[PDB]
Design a protein around this ligand. Structure first.
Ligand SMILES: O=C(O)c1ccc2c(c1)nc(NCCCCCCNCc1ccc(-c3ccccc3)c(Cl)c1)c1ccncc12
Length: 331
């Protein structure tokens, strides 16, 4: 008869109450600066939609990052631009500094603030239980902010979180998959990295909301405190749901399906099976116990839920006991 609809249980109407121009990005007009103000120094990394360079602004001699965009639909470029401008200034959101086009190739590029990225190779062994709480809280500062601004990020993952540990500075980057939230809108489920896709993505439930981001955050936290990168190591989109089902159990998954009347792809009909809801203690071992704790496991369990309505919000997460220590130190 159809899927049951869903509404975000926070920030539901934030966008309706704004002027059309806030979220109607398709009609945004963009001011292309001259790429010749910036000279590229070196390639800092590529990806599916872009390549990133360290660059220098020749007018003020300042270090900077230029993100040249591989061809995407014109709407998506305006979308990312509109969203960085609405989010500009917000806590731990990367700052868009300029929007330039190349003179000859006419290909567009966004110019961002430079962040001395701390080497994550040596950062994986000098990570204390406090540092994970501290930097997890910084991510929620940014997630709660953009959720409160009506924007879901949809691509939270390690490669999209930068840390300058020297100065305890964190930045949430790549907003090219982010969208505005609009009650009742149906979204594209083919988003995010495969290991961070939320169950609502894998069962093709299009009416999701900010809580999508909390699942991803739960996948990161789990890989951190258990030192298992990635925590749900599926071999494709279908098996990714099975890898989740082997940890969360099937009983809750089929409950979720019935609650929202989601019709399950028949490809799933013979690979899910019957699996119990495991206990988090299974994943705890000598090399990772120094980060696992009763609070962390409680906080993790309240993030990784099938039903997107029941995951904590970003604001609820900050008020969890897991962060009681970093919240007092910020005083
Ligand atoms: O496209 C954009 O908008 C954009 C904007 C600006 C920049 C950009 C892209 N790309 C840059 N270079 C790409 C490098 C890859 C990121 C490295 C991943 N970082 C691991 C990592 C560590 C620790 C944790 C963690 C989590 C929880 C608790 C403790 C630690 C996590 Cl989760 C991940 C860049 C460089 C310099 N300046 C600006 C930008």
């Amino acid at each position: 008869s159809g899927p049951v609809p869903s509404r975000a249980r926070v920030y539901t109407d934030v966008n309706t109450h704004r002027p059309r121009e806030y979220w109607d990005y398709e009609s945004h007009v963009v001011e292309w600066g001259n790429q010749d103000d910036y000279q590229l120094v070196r390639k800092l990394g590529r990806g599916k939609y872009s390549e990133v360079f360290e660059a220098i602004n020749i007018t003020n001699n300042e270090k900077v990052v230029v993100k040249i965009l591989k061809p995407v639909k014109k709407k998506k470029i305006k979308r990312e631009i509109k969203i960085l401008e609405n989010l500009r200034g917000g806590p731990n959101i990367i700052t868009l500094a300029d929007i330039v086009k190349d003179p000859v190739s006419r290909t567009p590029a966004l110019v961002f603030e430079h962040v001395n990225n701390t080497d994550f190779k040596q950062l994986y062994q000098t990570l204390t239980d406090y540092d994970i709480r501290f930097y997890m809280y910084e991510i929620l500062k940014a997630l709660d902010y953009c959720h409160s601004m009506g924007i879901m990020h949809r691509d939270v993952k390690p490669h999209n979180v930068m840390i300058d540990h020297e100065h305890r500075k964190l930045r949430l980057i790549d907003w090219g998959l982010a969208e505005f939230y609009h009650p009742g809108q149906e979204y594209n489920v083919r988003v995010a990295s495969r290991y961070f896709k939320g169950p609502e993505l894998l069962v093709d439930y299009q009416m999701y909301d900010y809580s999508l981001d909390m699942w991803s955050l739960g996948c990161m936290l789990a890989s951190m405190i258990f030192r298992k990168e990635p925590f749900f190591h599926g071999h494709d989109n279908y098996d990714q749901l099975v890898r989740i089902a082997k940890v969360l159990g099937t009983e809750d998954l089929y409950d979720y399906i019935d609650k929202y009347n989601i019709e399950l792809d028949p490809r799933f009909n013979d690979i899910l099976g019957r699996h119990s809801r495991k206990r988090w203690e299974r994943f705890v071992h000598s090399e990772n116990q120094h980060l696992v704790s009763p609070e962390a496991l409680d906080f993790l369990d309240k993030l990784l839920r099938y039903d997107h309505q029941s995951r904590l919000t970003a604001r609820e997460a900050m008020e969890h006991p897991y962060f009681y220590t970093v919240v007092k130190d910020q005083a």
